[PDB]
Amino acid sequence: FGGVSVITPGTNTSNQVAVLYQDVNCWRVYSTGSNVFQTRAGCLIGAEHVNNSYECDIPIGAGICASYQTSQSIIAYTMSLGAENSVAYSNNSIAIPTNFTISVTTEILPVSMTKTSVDCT
Amino acid sequence: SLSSTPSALGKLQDVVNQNAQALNTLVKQLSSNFGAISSVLNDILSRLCPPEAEVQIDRLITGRLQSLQTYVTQQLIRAAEIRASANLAATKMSECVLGQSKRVDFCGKGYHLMSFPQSAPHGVVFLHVTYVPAQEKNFTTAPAICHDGKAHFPREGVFVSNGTHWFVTQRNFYEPQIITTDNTFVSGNCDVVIGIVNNTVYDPLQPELDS
Amino acid sequence: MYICGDSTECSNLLLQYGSFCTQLNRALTGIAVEQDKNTQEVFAQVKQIYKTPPIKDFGGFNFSQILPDPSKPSKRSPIEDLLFNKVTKFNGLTVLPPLLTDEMIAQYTSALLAGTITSGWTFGAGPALQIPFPMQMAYRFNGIGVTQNVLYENQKLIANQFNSAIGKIQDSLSSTPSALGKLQDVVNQNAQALNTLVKQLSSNFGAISSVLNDILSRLCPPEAEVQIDRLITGRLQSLQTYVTQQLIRAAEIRASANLAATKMSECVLGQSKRVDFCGKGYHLMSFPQSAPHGVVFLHVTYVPAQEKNFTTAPAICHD
Ligand SMILES: *[C@@H]1O[C@H](CO)[C@@H](O[C@@H]2O[C@H](CO)[C@@H](O)[C@H](O)[C@H]2NC(C)=O)[C@H](O)[C@H]1NC(C)=O
Ligand SMILES: *[C@@H]1O[C@H](CO)[C@@H](O[C@@H]2O[C@H](CO)[C@@H](O)[C@H](O)[C@H]2NC(C)=O)[C@H](O)[C@H]1NC(C)=O
Ligand SMILES: *[C@@H]1O[C@H](CO)[C@@H](O[C@@H]2O[C@H](CO)[C@@H](O)[C@H](O)[C@H]2NC(C)=O)[C@H](O)[C@H]1NC(C)=O
Ligand SMILES: *[C@@H]1O[C@H](CO)[C@@H](O[C@@H]2O[C@H](CO)[C@@H](O)[C@H](O)[C@H]2NC(C)=O)[C@H](O)[C@H]1NC(C)=O
Numbered sequence: 001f002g003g004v005s006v007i008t009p010g011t012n013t014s015n016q017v018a019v020l021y022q023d024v025n026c027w028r029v030y031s032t033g034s035n036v037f038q039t040r041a042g043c044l045i046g047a048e049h050v051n052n053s054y055e056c057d058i059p060i061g062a063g064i065c066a067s068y069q070t071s072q073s074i075i076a077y078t079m080s081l082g083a084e085n086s087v088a089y090s091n092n093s094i095a096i097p098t099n100f101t102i103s104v105t106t107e108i109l110p111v112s113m114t115k116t117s118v119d120c121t
Numbered sequence: 122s123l124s125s126t127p128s129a130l131g132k133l134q135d136v137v138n139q140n141a142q143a144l145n146t147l148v149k150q151l152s153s154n155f156g157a158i159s160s161v162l163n164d165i166l167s168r169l170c171p172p173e174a175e176v177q178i179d180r181l182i183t184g185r186l187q188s189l190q191t192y193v194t195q196q197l198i199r200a201a202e203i204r205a206s207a208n209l210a211a212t213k214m215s216e217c218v219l220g221q222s223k224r225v226d227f228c229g230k231g232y233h234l235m236s237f238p239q240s241a242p243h244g245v246v247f248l249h250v251t252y253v254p255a256q257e258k259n260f261t262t263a264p265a266i267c268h269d270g271k272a273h274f275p276r277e278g279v280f281v282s283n284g285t286h287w288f289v290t291q292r293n294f295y296e297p298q299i300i301t302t303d304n305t306f307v308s309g310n311c312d313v314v315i316g317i318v319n320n321t322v323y324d325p326l327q328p329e330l331d332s
Numbered sequence: 333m334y335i336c337g338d339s340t341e342c343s344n345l346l347l348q349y350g351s352f353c354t355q356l357n358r359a360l361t362g363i364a365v366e367q368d369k370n371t372q373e374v375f376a377q378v379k380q381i382y383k384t385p386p387i388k389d390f391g392g393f394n395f396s397q398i399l400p401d402p403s404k405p406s407k408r409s410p411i412e413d414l415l416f417n418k419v420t421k422f423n424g425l426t427v428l429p430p431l432l433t434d435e436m437i438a439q440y441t442s443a444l445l446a447g448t449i450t451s452g453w454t455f456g457a458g459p460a461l462q463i464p465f466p467m468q469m470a471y472r473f474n475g476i477g478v479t480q481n482v483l484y485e486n487q488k489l490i491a492n493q494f495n496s497a498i499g500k501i502q503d504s505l506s507s508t509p510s511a512l513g514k515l516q517d518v519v520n521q522n523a524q525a526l527n528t529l530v531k532q533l534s535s536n537f538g539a540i541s542s543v544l545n546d547i548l549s550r551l552c553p554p555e556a557e558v559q560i561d562r563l564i565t566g567r568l569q570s571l572q573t574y575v576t577q578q579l580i581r582a583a584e585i586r587a588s589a590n591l592a593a594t595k596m597s598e599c600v601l602g603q604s605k606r607v608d609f610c611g612k613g614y615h616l617m618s619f620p621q622s623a624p625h626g627v628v629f630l631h632v633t634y635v636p637a638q639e640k641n642f643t644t645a646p647a648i649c650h651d
């Protein structure tokens with residue numbers, strides 16, 4: 001047994017969905033649509049697994065995310081943690097900026113919520 | 122960004138949505154029977170005969186009391202989350218707006234210069250202005266310069282070198298200076314520092330003493 | 333599954349209550365989401381995965397017990413391997429996996445160390461800029477009010493004191509099992525909350541039997557309804573108690589996670605002047621290590637040692 005969840009690209013884009021069974025040895029599922037993939041997070045049906053990692057969009061669990069990509073269909077992939085960067089470390093070498101930019105960013109915090117009162121009678 | 126990306130204000134929209142749902146739930150739980158013959162107190166009062174009405178009324182009371190206790194407990198927990206956010210927002214205004222902060226990534230990514238608050242429904246928006254180093258170059262370095270057997274260290278800077286010459290720059294910006302006795306200070310001899318290199322440290326006054 | 337165990341009669345009686353399944357499940361879902369958010373905020377503070385050079389030429393400083401061990405099946409440092417080895421459904425209870433597996437946490441931690449070691453704090457504020465490790469230390473020394481002369485003249489001593497301190501940490505974590513008690517306690521409290529939920533399930537709560545199947549098998553339908561309802565009330569109270577406790581506990585974890593995230597930004601991706609925030613003594617630098625359900629920070633501080641008594645004066649009078 002387990003819960004069932006639906007992986008949905010927004011409906012303002014497409015109506016294809018993939019369905020995840022949380023704890024099934026993916027066998028033990030009566031659904032169709034092919035594209036049956038077994039993961040640590042459950043039985044995923046309808047998403048195409050690919051070997052191309054990418055930035056996470058809709059998370060599934062256990063390192064797996066899904067997205068709607070090329071026409072287009074839902075795919076499953078291992079999430080990337082970012083681009084690699086090998087720093088040219090050396091005992092006699094330093095990098096120094098010769099220019100700069102000014103960046104302004106935005107941070108948002110809640111301060112308050114609606115104040116209510118309830119008459120119990 | 123704020124105009125084209127509606128998710129930008131999702132934090133404030135979420136506070137509104139959660140409280141709206143807590144109230145809508147309270148309202149809808151009200152219409153459940155909770156084991157009573159009817160959820161409408163007036164139906165019980167209008168047709169059921171008084172001693173039986175007492176029993177059915179009491180079933181509704183228990184159900185409604187549980188609904189209210191659940192609502193209040195949830196509002197107390199949610200209120201605590203809002204208070205924590207408000208305390209953080211107040212801290213940030215004192216430290217990011219009424220000063221300059223050295224706390225890393227506290228007042229935005231990059232080196233903080235200043236911030237400007239803006240009002241928003243049920244919250245505050247901070248515009249954080251930061252300095253970000255841009256295009257860099259690869260320079261050769263050394264911990265010290267060996268002049269006449271004495272070891273010279275920068276007072277405020279880093280020794281760097283291009284393919285043929287040694288200069289001293291400020292750490293965060295490539296603005297090379299001639300290495301002089303005004304830019305460096307002396308401590309110890311040339312044998313103790315590992316990786317010390319030979320250069321000429323210029324005495325800015327000697328030429329006047331010589332002339 | 334928790335309350336009725338697929339009993340049809342019980343489910344139909346649950347429909348006479350308010351929308352309690354929706355609220356219990358949504359509250360637990362909200363917690364589950366928050367738990368990935370906490371992990372993401374604490375560890376994913378670096379946008380690129382920085383890698384180290386072959387580990388050589390760091391001024392004599394030895395980082396081998398904090399950096400990943402290439403010989404293992406899981407690329408964790410010797411300290412992380414120690415931390416991981418030391419910390420220890422019938423009713424509808426499902427355990428969900430994290431989004432970031434231990435392997436991904438290890439990669440984020442490794443990236444942060446690579447950044448800290450080869451570019452100081454610049455990988456934080458802007459692009460990573462390479463710097464010789466000893467110069468990085470020189471700047472960290474100026475940052476505590478000690479000049480650069482001290483580091484270079486004593487570079488060999490400093491590297492040796494540093495290297496010995498790291499070895500001491502491994503011995504401490506290995507020999508003192510209480511060292512990781514905070515993480516073990518989080519595990520133990522949640523395990524107990526679930527075990528309690530499971531055991532409350534078998535109480536009668538005023539019913540003739542706690543086994544719904546006994547009621548259904550021998551008791552005649554109108555009487556079964558009464559006994560089933562007694563069990564439903566008891567089980568609902570058990571679930572509401574469980575969820576409320578998880579919400580409170582979740583809040584405590586969130587506060588800890590917010591602090592851990594703050595500390596990484598301020599202790600690891602910079603140098604901090606906040607007293608006793610990044611350890612006792614004058615802070616020079618810190619190195620994170622992964623642990624089950626948490627983060628371990630190794631904080632490197634400068635501590636003044638043997639002092640002497642000198643006479644002083646506020647000023648000197650010359651002419
Ligand atoms: C430039 O570096 C060289 C070392 O590479 C220094 O040479 C030494 O100088 C001392 C003092 O006169 C002698 O006793 C050593 O025998 C020299 N070493 C060698 C290998 O010959 C030289 O003095 C440095 N120049 C300056 C201005 O400091
Ligand atoms: C390192 O910087 C120095 C200083 O700018 C460069 O030397 C000067 O080059 C200009 C021509 O561009 C000449 O007119 C000056 O007389 C030079 N100054 C000195 C003191 O020689 C030097 O070429 C740069 N080195 C490299 C490899 O780029
Ligand atoms: C960092 O310190 C460790 C010890 O804590 C060094 O480990 C030694 O490595 C060699 C070569 O693999 C082994 O033969 C020794 O037996 C190891 N020592 C111990 C006590 O087990 C490591 O080489 C040092 N690394 C650097 C760069 O200095
Ligand atoms: C400052 O303290 C350090 C120890 O923290 C002293 O270094 C030790 O000196 C003894 C005696 O020569 C050696 O056996 C140890 O191996 C040294 N320790 C290390 C880590 O190298 C140092 O001599 C003291 N120094 C002063 C006042 O200069």
Ligand SMILES: *[C@@H]1O[C@H](CO)[C@@H](O[C@@H]2O[C@H](CO)[C@@H](O)[C@H](O)[C@H]2NC(C)=O)[C@H](O)[C@H]1NC(C)=O
Binds near residue numbers: 649650651
């Ligand atoms: C050393 O300290 C003494 C005070 O203890 C200074 O003496 C005074 O100097 C002024 C200026 O010449 C005289 O008007 C006072 O009468 C002196 N005091 C006494 C008690 O005689 C002396 O000038 C100081 N030395 C220096 C270099 O500043």
Ligand SMILES: *[C@@H]1O[C@H](CO)[C@@H](O)[C@H](O)[C@H]1NC(C)=O
Binds near residue numbers: 025026038
């Ligand atoms: C599914 O069952 C087979 C045995 O029939 C087993 O070999 C396999 O590892 C199981 N897969 C999962 C995900 O449990």
Ligand SMILES: *[C@@H]1O[C@H](CO)[C@@H](O)[C@H](O)[C@H]1NC(C)=O
Binds near residue numbers: 259
């Ligand atoms: C520094 O040198 C390395 C050599 O591998 C090169 O990849 C890097 O782009 C250079 N950096 C700059 C700022 O020129």
Ligand SMILES: *[C@@H]1O[C@H](CO)[C@@H](O)[C@H](O)[C@H]1NC(C)=O
Binds near residue numbers: 091092315316389
């Ligand atoms: C850097 O390493 C090279 C090769 O071992 C050595 O010759 C040089 O002196 C070192 N420089 C410094 C500053 O340690």
Ligand SMILES: *[C@@H]1O[C@H](CO)[C@@H](O)[C@H](O)[C@H]1NC(C)=O
Binds near residue numbers: 639640641
């Ligand atoms: C300073 O003098 C006092 C005199 O009572 C003595 O107790 C103390 O140990 C001395 N401190 C040092 C560092 O020598």
